Amino acid sequence: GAMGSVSCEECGGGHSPSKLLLCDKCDRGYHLFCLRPILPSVPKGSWFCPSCSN
């Protein structure tokens, strides 16, 4: 089925969907390469963005 309409909050882009991480609280999307610090690959297990990791 189709992907959802999510875009990266940092760059506004919906490209590179295999690297577009969804936060397990706020559900906003962030490309691995738009995060700072940068992530080199999709993390194993549940993942939380900086605003939600607390």
Binding site: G1, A2, M3, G4, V6, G14, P17, S18, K19, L20, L21, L22, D24, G29, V42, P43, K44, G45, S46, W47
Partner: peptide, 11 residues
Amino acid sequence: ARTKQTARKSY
């Protein structure tokens, strides 16, 4: 972790 790529239905 979930990504835009994985966030879809596969029937």
